[PDB]
């Protein structure tokens, strides 16, 4: 229920990222429409370009936590919480 | 936690009342937002 | 540690004088 509230707040952050880039597309539209009303000079293009889908590897914490409780009883003793922190 | 939750049921009767006038301010906001779109259409072109 | 402060003005006044001959 906190992942609902938090990932809904990260949806609206992720929406505000695209909506601020829509406001930059309204600016960049006016930059090229000013340029093409000049058609020559206010020319807009680009693009994040170089390395701009980076090596975000990240490959984040894909932790397969196997709780291998080897039940020959409980205080004898095998709480094997195998944290396979995988980097997918 | 039920005496808390049953008083909390009466909180939703108040919060649904409050949110129904918030959704009435948001409906009035859409009617002003439609008048502003018709103003913007006339304002960008004469 | 190689080097400090200054190599520019001796390199620049030369490459400027080459570019300035043209």
């Amino acid at each position: 229920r906190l992942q609902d509230e938090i990932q809904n707040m990260k949806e609206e952050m992720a929406r505000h990222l695209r909506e601020y880039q829509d406001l930059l597309n309204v600016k960049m539209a006016l930059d090229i429409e000013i340029a093409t009303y000049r058609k020559f000079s206010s020319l807009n293009l680009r693009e994040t370009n170089l390395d701009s889908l980076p090596l975000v590897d990240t490959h984040s914490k894909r932790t397969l936590l196997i709780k291998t409780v080897e039940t020959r009883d409980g205080q004898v003793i095998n709480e094997t919480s195998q944290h396979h922190d995988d980097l997918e | 936690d039920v005496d808390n939750a049953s008083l909390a049921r009466l909180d939703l009767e108040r919060k649904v009342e409050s949110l129904q006038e918030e959704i009435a301010f948001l409906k009035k906001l859409h009617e002003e937002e439609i008048q502003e779109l018709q103003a913007q259409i006339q304002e960008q072109h004469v | 540690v190689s080097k400090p402060d200054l190599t520019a003005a001796l390199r620049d006044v030369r490459q400027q004088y080459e570019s300035v001959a043209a």
Partner: protein, 73 residues
């Protein structure tokens, strides 16, 4: 620090100051890469002085401290 811009009492001398300050900015950054040499040794010496404490902490102490109690059992 607080440098004063006072004393300015009013294109070759534009391009001369674009030159002269950058004949003095290769300069400060040749001095910076010689300071950053000191930061590179301070960082390699900081990995060294963490690794030297991991060395002392594990090798003779912690591995001795354990197997000297197992040998007592």
């Amino acid at each position: 620090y607080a440098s004063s811009p006072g004393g300015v009492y009013a294109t070759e001398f534009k391009n001369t100051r674009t030159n002269e300050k950058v004949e003095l900015q290769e300069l400060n950054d040749r001095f910076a890469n010689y300071i950053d040499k000191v930061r590179f040794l301070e960082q390699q010496n900081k990995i060294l002085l963490a690794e030297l404490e991991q060395l002392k902490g594990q090798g003779k102490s912690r591995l001795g401290d354990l197997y000297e109690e197992e040998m007592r059992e």
